[PDB]
Amino acid sequence: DPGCSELIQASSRITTCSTEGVNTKCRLSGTALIRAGSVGAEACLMLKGVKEDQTKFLKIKTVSSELSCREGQSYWTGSFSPKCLSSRRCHLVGECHVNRCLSWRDNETSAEFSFVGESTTMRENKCFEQCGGWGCGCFNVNPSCLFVHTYLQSVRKEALRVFNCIDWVHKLTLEITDFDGSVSTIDLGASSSRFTNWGSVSLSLDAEGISGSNSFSFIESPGKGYAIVDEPFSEIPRQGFLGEIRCNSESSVLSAHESCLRAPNLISYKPMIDQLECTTNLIDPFVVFERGSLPQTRNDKTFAASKGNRGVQAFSKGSVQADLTLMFDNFEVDFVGAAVSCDAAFLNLTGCYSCNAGARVCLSITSTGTGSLSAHNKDGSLHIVLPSENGTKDQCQILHFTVPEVEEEFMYSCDGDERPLLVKGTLIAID
Amino acid sequence: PMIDQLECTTNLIDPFVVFERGSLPQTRNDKTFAASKGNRGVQAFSKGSVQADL
Amino acid sequence: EDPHLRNRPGKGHNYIDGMTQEDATCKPVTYAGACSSFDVLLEKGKFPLFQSYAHHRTLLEAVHDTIIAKADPPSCDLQSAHGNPCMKEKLVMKTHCPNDYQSAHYLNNDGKMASVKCPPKYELTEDCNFCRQMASLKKGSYPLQDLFCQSSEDDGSKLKTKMKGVCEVGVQALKKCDGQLSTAHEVVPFAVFKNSKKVYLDKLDLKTEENLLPDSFVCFEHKGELKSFDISQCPKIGGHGSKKCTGDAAFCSAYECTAQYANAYCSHANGSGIVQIQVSGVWKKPLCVGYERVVVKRELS
Amino acid sequence: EDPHLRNRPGKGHNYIDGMTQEDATCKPVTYAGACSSFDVLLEKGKFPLFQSYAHHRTLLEAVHDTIIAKADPPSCDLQSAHGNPCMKEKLVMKTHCPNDYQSAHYLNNDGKMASVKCPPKYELTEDCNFCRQMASLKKGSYPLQDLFCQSSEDDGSKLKTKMKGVCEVGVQALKKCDGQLSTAHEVVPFAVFKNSKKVYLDKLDLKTEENLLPDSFVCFEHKGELKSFDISQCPKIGGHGSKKCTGDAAFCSAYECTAQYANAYCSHANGSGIVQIQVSGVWKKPLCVGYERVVVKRELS
């Protein structure tokens, strides 16, 4: 809902007007200050040119108060399944030595497994010795050797990304509306800056945060909900720990790329002369993902996921007190004086007073041409802007007052002549 | 990183915040801190006598 | 690597007006082709943008693509008097021109192929603004701009230069500067859509969205060097087109392979897709986007 | 901004009365000719002042510009007996000078160009006090001090030498030292105003105000290798001139330029403009600021 709760006038030092083509335009080469609105309220920016009727506004719609998280050390993980390959050869035959398989390197392809193919996965090569003689089908009296070639492949169709948060950044999703009417939805957290068409903007004051976030690990699911685990961040991946096999990207887990990391001496083996069953006791993260699925109840906050932009948030129940810095990168603001008529009427006035919420106003603007309507009071502290077109439409915005019996006279116009207008409505006490 | 999109940002402290929250004149204890006239440099004003030798 | 540096998909004609000395070797553009208007585009340390976006179109190839018209006159003389169209847009340039060259083509404000040429046999100077007396002389022109094109058709007659806070840049008269003009030579990009003006930019954001498109395949003749062959002559499976086509498993999985009935070989390529541009927030399809070094007059105060 | 240290604005004469044997290769001073009174000022890493103020006049050119008076006699004969006026002013200038010379100009007390002469056949020694017999003999004049010259008409005849801590320098009798003094040899700069005295400098404070001046541009030529031509022949805005000349924004912003129709290329100079001095706590516009190495007698207890 529209309605600038806090309105301020730009300084004349950074406001220089001009004239080009029977039109008075001006640019801004500075930065103003305005209070950040609450949930529902806005923060307009009144811009004045050379006279009274030429007045522009920049509305910034605030969605809600959010606390985003800052990601640091991230890694992907998932389930896997080994595949043991056995190939027993006689002693003194090629490379069937009992001493070579003892110190056999993992990154060395043996002569009995050089015909596997393009296997760019987490592969390894061991060397377990067995028995010999004529009892197991061997010509030499010396014991035989069993070559091992086990490679890791992915069996789960999805994966999970385990990360942490070093600090809760108070992010505010702002829907900044330009002077002409261009709607741009951005976000500002702590002291971060973005890039808009009118220049740049960054959050100034910030007095809201949640301490104790390093001892909490988060899990992101592709498309599905997020997760939370009550434990510190995973250090070194060792045996018997959540996150013993990690990678770097989602494709490194969905395809089991050799560029990831794993625990040493983790793949177990069953030396059975000729048979071999390679089984690993991998930790299943889906159990923790199901036991700790967002949303959950943690202290007096509400931890959930986020729509559109991927990232963790934190719903709070406190006030909204912040400042905004509207940096104008020397952008011209033009305006054309309209000449269409518009007979508006008052409808109702509901809401509250003495609070950051405001009061909703109902106006039945009836115009005959496409343009804009500008309204103002008498002392110079309230301004209402509403679009106008050919037809009869019901508009309005959020207004702020400090009295339950609102009896303020408004002065709205649509071409030049200003006519009086009286509003009324009973409000309630809203903190 | 979002395949083809990118949102690079920083987290630096705005000096104009402290510059506006602590703009002179700002009294301290029992003095008055202000700027100089003509020459560039910080100065301070006191309420004592003048006892010096040239 | 990069096996698609000299291969030009689609048309591939680098014919220049006025400097008619390379018509024999210039159409089309093969791997073993000779043309001074394309060899310098892949030179190490000159135009990195063309080296990064090699599987696209150029300026003359876009003119011969029935999408960009030519200027009148297309080849202006450097020994004229008053009223030279290739004077204001040429003197404000900054890129140094190499030696052993006579002609130099670029893009005008209206979006047409504009070129200059001196009387034989006078070569260009250091800046390329004037001419002077004469390795060997090249038989073509030199691209003055590092721009590229593609297969687009969006209209851009309502979009103008979005350079805010800029008085006069290049040859366009934007707004009126209130302070003192600061003459500085900087690099400002430009963008030209289908039948539009030279729309300059400030922060170029180009993204690539590749998909199953016919431009992601090439075809070269057999050899019992390489040649040139159009890939658009290969119809779908279970049909018959104009020319025969064949390939491997990747090329035969989508198009019909005629085995020995063809005279080329289709291979799985890429580097194409649909490249978008960031103009006024809304992602559009560029047609003549690149970079041009002009004189920028900013406000000092 | 091509370094051209041969073009001399104004008159460009380098000769003195009584010894006009260098009016063939030095009247005026151009690329053609050989004059020892100008070729020694173009040494590499020897005279940084003349290299910094290349597009400025000197001392002899300032005398021939009818803006400053000359000493009487302008050429003191070092061969005649019964002494000469040019003895107490040059003897204190303990400096080095090569052989094969016949003249040496400097500044006296009345702010005039005082020089010497050597009739044939006599050459200067290592000091320049007397003339001895003699290979070619440089018939010009070796500048014993480094200075420049410019156009200025600012008043300042009541301003004399203002030094602190020095009782006597060069030959002038400044303040009266009732105590003792120490004789030393130091380098102390000096200055001169419009019809004044030799005002020495203690705190060298100089500045250059580069402005659109006619003596701050160099015109080239068009052939079809860019040699110099002239700057006084280029037409002006609303005036008349010989051949048309063009250039960048600086030359076209003040003069007339037709680019293609022009036959000359006028470019901006380097290190030229309004040069002022700071003496007695006030900014003044002198004629020429220089330095020398003479006897400095400071104060001593």
Side-chain angles (χ1 to χ4, degrees), chain C residues 20-25 27-34 36-75 77-85 87-96 98-117 119-127 129-130 132-148 150-166 168-176 178-218 220-233 235-244 246-251 253-256 258-264:
Chain C
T20 61
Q21 290 182 358
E22 61 182 2
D23 187 74
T25 61
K27 293 185 264 75
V29 176
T30 185
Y31 294 98
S36 66
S37 296
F38 184 74
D39 290 331
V40 296
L41 293 173
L42 293 173
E43 186 177 1
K44 299 293 183 182
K46 295 293 180 69
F47 288 162
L49 183 62
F50 185 78
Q51 294 179 356
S52 297
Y53 291 162
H55 189 74
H56 292 89
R57 271 73 174 174
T58 61
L59 183 62
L60 296 176
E61 293 179 354
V63 173
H64 292 285
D65 204 2
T66 67
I67 59 180
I68 293 182
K70 65 182 181 180
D72 291 330
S75 179
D77 194 1
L78 294 174
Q79 295 297 109
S80 296
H82 294 88
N84 193 1
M87 185 269 287
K88 296 296 290 183
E89 294 178 353
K90 185 72 175 68
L91 187 63
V92 299
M93 288 184 182
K94 189 68 176 177
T95 301
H96 179 75
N99 298 115
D100 292 331
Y101 279 102
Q102 184 178 2
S103 179
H105 64 278
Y106 61 93
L107 184 63
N108 57 4
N109 195 3
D110 292 331
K112 293 180 181 180
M113 187 270 288
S115 66
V116 297
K117 183 174 72 68
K121 284 90 171 65
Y122 290 163
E123 65 180 0
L124 294 174
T125 62
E126 292 86 4
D127 55 355
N129 291 320
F130 290 160
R132 52 100 176 268
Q133 293 179 356
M134 180 65 170
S136 66
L137 183 62
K138 298 293 183 182
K139 301 291 179 68
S141 178
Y142 179 76
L144 294 175
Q145 296 177 357
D146 192 1
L147 79 160
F148 64 95
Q150 63 183 357
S151 66
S152 178
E153 65 183 2
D154 291 332
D155 194 2
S157 66
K158 83 281 289 179
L159 294 174
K160 298 292 180 68
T161 301
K162 298 295 289 183
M163 290 181 72
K164 60 183 180 293
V166 176
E168 293 179 353
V169 55
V171 297
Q172 294 179 356
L174 295 175
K175 60 99 175 179
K176 180 67 173 66
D178 291 331
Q180 184 178 2
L181 294 174
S182 178
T183 300
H185 295 89
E186 293 179 353
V187 176
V188 174
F190 64 95
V192 174
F193 289 163
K194 181 68 173 66
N195 297 115
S196 66
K197 300 294 187 291
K198 185 182 285 185
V199 173
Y200 291 100
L201 293 174
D202 291 330
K203 184 178 184 293
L204 183 62
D205 291 331
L206 295 175
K207 65 182 181 180
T208 301
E209 293 179 353
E210 293 179 354
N211 199 359
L212 293 175
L213 293 175
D215 291 331
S216 296
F217 292 100
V218 298
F220 62 94
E221 293 182 354
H222 298 286
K223 180 67 174 66
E225 293 179 353
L226 295 175
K227 300 294 187 291
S228 66
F229 183 75
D230 194 1
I231 201 59
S232 67
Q233 297 294 321
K236 299 298 293 295
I237 59 179
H240 187 273
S242 178
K243 293 182 183 293
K244 303 295 186 291
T246 187
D248 55 355
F251 184 76
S253 66
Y255 289 164
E256 181 67 28
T258 61
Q260 71 272 16
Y261 288 164
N263 297 115

Side-chain angles (χ1 to χ4, degrees), chain A residues 16 18-21 23 25 27-28 330-333, chain C residues 163-166 168-169 172-176 178-182 297-301:
Chain A
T16 61
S18 179
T19 300
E20 183 178 1
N23 288 317
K25 67 181 178 66
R27 78 277 295 152
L28 293 173
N330 196 358
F331 182 74
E332 292 180 352
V333 177
Chain C
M163 290 181 72
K164 60 183 180 293
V166 176
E168 293 179 353
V169 55
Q172 294 179 356
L174 295 175
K175 60 99 175 179
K176 180 67 173 66
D178 291 331
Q180 184 178 2
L181 294 174
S182 178
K297 293 181 181 179
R298 292 181 184 271
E299 293 179 353
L300 183 62
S301 58

Side-chain angles (χ1 to χ4, degrees), chain A residues 5 39 42 62 75 110 164 175 179 181 184 193 198-199 298 301 310 331 373-374 381 393 403 420:
Chain A
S5 62
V39 177
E42 293 182 351
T62 301
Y75 62 93
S110 178
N164 55 2
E175 186 176 0
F179 295 102
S184 66
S193 67
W198 58 273
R298 297 291 185 269
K301 300 294 187 291
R310 296 290 92 192
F331 182 74
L373 192 145
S374 179
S381 66
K393 298 291 180 68
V403 54

Side-chain angles (χ1 to χ4, degrees), chain D residues 256 258-265 267-270:
Chain D
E256 183 179 1
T258 60
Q260 296 298 109
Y261 186 75
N263 296 115
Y265 183 75
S267 179
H268 186 73
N270 205 166

Side-chain angles (χ1 to χ4, degrees), chain D residues 64-75 77:
Chain D
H64 290 287
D65 204 3
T66 68
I67 62 180
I68 192 180
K70 64 179 73 174
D72 290 330
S75 66
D77 186 74

